[PDB]
Short mmCIF file of C-alpha atoms in Angstrom, two decimals:
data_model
loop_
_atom_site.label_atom_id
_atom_site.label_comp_id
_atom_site.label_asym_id
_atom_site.label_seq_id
_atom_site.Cartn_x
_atom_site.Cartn_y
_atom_site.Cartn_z
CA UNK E 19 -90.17 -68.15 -51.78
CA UNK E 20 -86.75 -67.45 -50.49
CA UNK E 21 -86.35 -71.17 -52.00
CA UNK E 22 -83.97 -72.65 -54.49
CA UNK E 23 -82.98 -76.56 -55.79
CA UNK E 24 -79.95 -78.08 -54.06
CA UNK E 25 -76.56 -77.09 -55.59
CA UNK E 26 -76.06 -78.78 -58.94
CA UNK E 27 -74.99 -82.55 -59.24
CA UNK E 28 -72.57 -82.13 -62.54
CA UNK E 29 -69.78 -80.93 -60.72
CA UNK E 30 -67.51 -83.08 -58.17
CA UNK E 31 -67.07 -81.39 -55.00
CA UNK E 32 -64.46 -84.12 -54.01
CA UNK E 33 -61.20 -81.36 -53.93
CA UNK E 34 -64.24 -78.30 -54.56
CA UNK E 35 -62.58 -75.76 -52.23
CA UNK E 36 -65.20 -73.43 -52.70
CA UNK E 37 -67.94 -75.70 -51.86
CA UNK E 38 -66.65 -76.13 -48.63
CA UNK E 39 -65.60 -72.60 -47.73
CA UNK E 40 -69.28 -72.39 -48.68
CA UNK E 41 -70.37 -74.62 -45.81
CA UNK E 42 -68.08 -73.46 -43.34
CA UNK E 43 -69.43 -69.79 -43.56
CA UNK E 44 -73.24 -71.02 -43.13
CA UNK E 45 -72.65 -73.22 -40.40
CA UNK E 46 -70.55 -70.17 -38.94
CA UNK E 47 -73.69 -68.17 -38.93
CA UNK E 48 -75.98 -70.77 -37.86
CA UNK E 49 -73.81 -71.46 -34.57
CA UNK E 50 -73.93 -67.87 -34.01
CA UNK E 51 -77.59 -67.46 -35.47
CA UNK E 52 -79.12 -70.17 -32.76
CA UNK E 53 -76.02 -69.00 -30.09
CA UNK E 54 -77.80 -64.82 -30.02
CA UNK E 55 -81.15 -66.34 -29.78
CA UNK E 56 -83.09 -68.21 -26.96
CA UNK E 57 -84.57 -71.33 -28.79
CA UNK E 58 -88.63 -72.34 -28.76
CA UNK E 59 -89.68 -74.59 -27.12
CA UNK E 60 -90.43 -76.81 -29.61
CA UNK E 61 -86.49 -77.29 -30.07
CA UNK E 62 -85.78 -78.17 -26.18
CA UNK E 63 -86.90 -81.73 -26.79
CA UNK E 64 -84.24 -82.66 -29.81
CA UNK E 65 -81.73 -81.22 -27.44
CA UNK E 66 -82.56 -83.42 -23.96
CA UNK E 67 -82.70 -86.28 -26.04
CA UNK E 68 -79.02 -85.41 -27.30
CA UNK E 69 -77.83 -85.30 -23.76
CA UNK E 70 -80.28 -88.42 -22.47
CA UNK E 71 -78.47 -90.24 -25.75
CA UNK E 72 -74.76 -88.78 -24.07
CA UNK E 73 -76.18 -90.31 -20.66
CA UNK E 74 -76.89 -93.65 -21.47
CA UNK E 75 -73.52 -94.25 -23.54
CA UNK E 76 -72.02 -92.93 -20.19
CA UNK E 77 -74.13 -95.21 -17.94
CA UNK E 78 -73.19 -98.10 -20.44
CA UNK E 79 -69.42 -97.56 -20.59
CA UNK E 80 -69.51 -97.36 -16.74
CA UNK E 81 -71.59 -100.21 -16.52
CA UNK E 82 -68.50 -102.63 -18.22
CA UNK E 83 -65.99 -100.82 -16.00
CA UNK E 84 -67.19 -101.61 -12.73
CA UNK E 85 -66.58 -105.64 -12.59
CA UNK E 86 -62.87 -104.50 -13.06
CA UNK E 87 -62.64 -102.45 -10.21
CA UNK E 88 -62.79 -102.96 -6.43
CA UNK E 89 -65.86 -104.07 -4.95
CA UNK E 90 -65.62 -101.58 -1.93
CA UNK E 91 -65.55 -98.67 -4.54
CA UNK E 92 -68.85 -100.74 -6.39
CA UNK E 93 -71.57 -98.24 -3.99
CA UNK E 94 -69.54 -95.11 -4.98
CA UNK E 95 -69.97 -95.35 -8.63
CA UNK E 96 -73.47 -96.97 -8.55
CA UNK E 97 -74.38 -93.89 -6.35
CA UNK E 98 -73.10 -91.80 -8.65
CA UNK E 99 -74.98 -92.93 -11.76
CA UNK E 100 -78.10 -92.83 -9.22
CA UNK E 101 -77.37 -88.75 -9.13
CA UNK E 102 -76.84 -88.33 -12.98
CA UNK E 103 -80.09 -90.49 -13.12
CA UNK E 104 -81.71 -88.18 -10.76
CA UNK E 105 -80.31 -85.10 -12.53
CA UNK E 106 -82.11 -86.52 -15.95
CA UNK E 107 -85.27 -86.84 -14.34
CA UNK E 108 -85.05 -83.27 -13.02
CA UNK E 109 -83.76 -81.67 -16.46
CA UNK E 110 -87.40 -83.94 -18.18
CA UNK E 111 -89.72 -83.01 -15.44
CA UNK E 112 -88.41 -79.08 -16.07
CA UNK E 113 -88.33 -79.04 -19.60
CA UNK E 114 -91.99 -79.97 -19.59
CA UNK E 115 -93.14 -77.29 -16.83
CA UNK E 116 -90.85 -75.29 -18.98
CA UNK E 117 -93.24 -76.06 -21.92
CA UNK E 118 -96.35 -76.91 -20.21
CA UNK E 119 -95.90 -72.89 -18.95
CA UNK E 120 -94.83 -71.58 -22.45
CA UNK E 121 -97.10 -68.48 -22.66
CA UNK E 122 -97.13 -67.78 -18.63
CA UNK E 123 -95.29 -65.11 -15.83
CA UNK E 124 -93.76 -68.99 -15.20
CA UNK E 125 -91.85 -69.17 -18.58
CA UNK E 126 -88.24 -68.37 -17.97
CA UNK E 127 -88.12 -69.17 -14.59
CA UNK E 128 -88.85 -72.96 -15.56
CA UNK E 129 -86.32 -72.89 -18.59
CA UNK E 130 -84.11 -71.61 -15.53
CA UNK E 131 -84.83 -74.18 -13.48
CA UNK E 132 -84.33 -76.83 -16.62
CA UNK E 133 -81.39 -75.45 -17.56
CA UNK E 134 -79.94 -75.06 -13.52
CA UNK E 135 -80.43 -79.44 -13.72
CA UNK E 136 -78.69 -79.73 -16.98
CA UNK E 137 -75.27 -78.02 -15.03
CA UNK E 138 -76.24 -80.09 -12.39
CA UNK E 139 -75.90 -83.01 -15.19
CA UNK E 140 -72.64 -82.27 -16.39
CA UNK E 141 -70.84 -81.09 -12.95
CA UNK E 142 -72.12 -85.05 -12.02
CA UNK E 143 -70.62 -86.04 -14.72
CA UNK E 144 -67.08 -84.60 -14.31
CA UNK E 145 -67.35 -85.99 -10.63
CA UNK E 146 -68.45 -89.49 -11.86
CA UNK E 147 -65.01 -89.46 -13.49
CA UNK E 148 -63.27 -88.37 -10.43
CA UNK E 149 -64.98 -91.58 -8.70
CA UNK E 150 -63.95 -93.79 -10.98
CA UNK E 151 -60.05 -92.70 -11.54
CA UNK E 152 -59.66 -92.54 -7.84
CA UNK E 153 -61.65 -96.35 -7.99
CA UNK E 154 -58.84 -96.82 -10.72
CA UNK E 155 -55.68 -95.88 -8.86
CA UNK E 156 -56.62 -97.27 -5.82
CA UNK E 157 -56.76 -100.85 -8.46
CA UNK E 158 -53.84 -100.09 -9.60
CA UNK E 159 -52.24 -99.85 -6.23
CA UNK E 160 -53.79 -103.09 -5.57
CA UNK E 161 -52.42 -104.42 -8.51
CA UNK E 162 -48.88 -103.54 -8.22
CA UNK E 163 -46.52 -106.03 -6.08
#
């Protein structure tokens, strides 16, 4: 019982100063709480879906940018989501070892591995942008008289 009811409802926290100072300071030691620790995992599912979510708003957006573009830069960027596509399936199938080996010698080097394709996620992502400004400059070279 280190429980107690949710703050009280008679006061307006619209300007409450205090309230939010409040908040700031607990979410200040949760970021650092869950930053110092290595997280179960139970939690490493919540978390892949937050970065499959990222993905497919990514794939999406680059989905309605490619009719604009050239169609000789077209097997670039579809190549491209292919990798980050790749690099999802790889960060899933290593979560799982990662869990299916959660009491094992095979632990750590699994949440390694997942977290090895995650990086591999995001550098793909950096260098999907790359592919598609050059694709974007070269249009706009194309464009110009």
């Amino acid at each position: 019982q280190e429980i107690s009811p949710p703050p009280t409802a008679n006061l307006d926290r619209s300007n409450d100063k205090v309230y939010e100072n409040v908040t700031g300071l607990v979410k200040a030691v949760i970021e650092m709480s869950s930053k110092i620790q290595p997280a179960p995992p139970e939690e490493y599912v919540p978390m892949v879906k937050e970065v499959g979510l990222a993905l497919r708003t990514l794939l999406a957006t680059v989905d309605e940018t490619i009719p604009l573009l050239p169609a000789s830069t077209h097997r670039e960027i579809e190549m491209a989501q292919k990798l980050l596509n790749s690099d999802l399936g790889e960060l899933i199938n290593k979560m799982k070892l990662a869990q299916q080996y959660v009491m094992t010698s095979l632990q750590q080097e699994y949440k390694k591995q997942m977290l090895t394709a995650a990086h591999a996620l995001a550098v793909d992502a950096k260098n999907l942008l790359d592919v598609i400004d050059q694709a974007r400059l070269k249009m706009l070279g194309q464009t110009r008289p």
